[PDB]
Amino acid sequence: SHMWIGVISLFPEMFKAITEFGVTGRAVKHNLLKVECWNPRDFTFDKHKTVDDRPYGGGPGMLMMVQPLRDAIHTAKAAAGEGAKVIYLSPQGRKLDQGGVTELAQNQKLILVCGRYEGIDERLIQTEIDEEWSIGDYVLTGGELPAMTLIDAVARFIPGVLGSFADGLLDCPHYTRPEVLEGLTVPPVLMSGHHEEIRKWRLKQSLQRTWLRRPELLEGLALTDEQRKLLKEAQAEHNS
């Protein structure tokens, strides 16, 4: 299930971070994922290739200039053809979570608009953007890292790209060599070779860690009978 992602960015070279390295770099090289960038600076006409503009109403800060950005977006939409969802990354957007990632991953084509400076004209959001998404409640210098984050997360859902959380829980602890590290030993159950006991231990650990660190995540879950039991056990041991 190929995925095509168009990107509008003043700094297209930043995306080398995901297109040239690791799992996502392999996905691109194998044509499982295609990332195509358009730079508003290429759509300027003035001598100094101006890509920012002053906000009506004054105040400090600049906005992205409308014409170059708008033209870049239109060009990306033309290349994308029918059925591309246009996304603007910003703190005003829907909060991204794994459920949201799975939904976005259902799209065969995405166009990601990366804001810089104080952002983009509200009317462009109204006329060009299908959805607004945020990767988190913090403020960055640009939308590029959010876009790459989104790309990385959805890429994991593409068949062939890959060689807890899916039940809404934090991950269990992981152990590798050596058997003893600064006096700390690997839990014996992991050495037992008892697949069922290992499965239950990992699940119990996930339930316990979710409960201790992120109890609000549990309220949103319909635990299985097995999960209810193991969580009760973990809570009992914690209270022991």
Span 110-139, contacts to ligand 4FV by CB under 6 A:
115-117, 119, 134-136, 138-139
Instruction: Indicate which single residue of 7, 89, 112, 153 sits in contact with a second copy (rule: CB under 8 A).
Output: 153
The reply on whether position 90 binds ligand 4FV by CB under 6 A is yes
d(CA 14, CA 37): 10
Is 38 within 8 Å of 141 (Cβ atoms)?
no
The reply on whether position 140 binds ligand 4FV by CB under 6 A is yes
Give the nearest distance from C-beta 29 to a second copy in angstroms: 14
Q: Which residues lie closer than 8 Å to 71 by C-beta, 6 or more apart? A: 40, 43
Which of a second copy, ligand 4FV, none is residue 170 near (CB under 5 to 8 Å by kind)?
a second copy
Q: Is 56 assigned to a binding site?
A: no
Which of a second copy, ligand 4FV, none is residue 123 near (CB under 5 to 8 Å by kind)?
a second copy
d(CA 38, CA 34): 13
d(CA 104, CA 100): 6
Give the nearest distance from C-beta 135 to ligand 4FV in angstroms: 4
The reply on whether position 138 binds a second copy by CB under 8 A is yes
Which of a second copy, ligand 4FV, none is residue 89 near (CB under 5 to 8 Å by kind)?
ligand 4FV
Q: Of the candidates 129, 10, 124, 133, which has an alpha carbon nearest to the alpha carbon of residue 70?
A: 124
Q: Is 163 assigned to a binding site?
A: no
Q: Which residues lie closer than 8 Å to 17 by C-beta, 6 or more apart? A: 148
Please give the backbone phi and psi of residue 76, each rounded to the nearest 5 degrees, phi first.
-65, -40
Q: Could you list the residues that contact ligand 4FV (CB under 6 A)?
A: 89-91, 115-117, 119, 134-136, 138-140, 142-143, 146
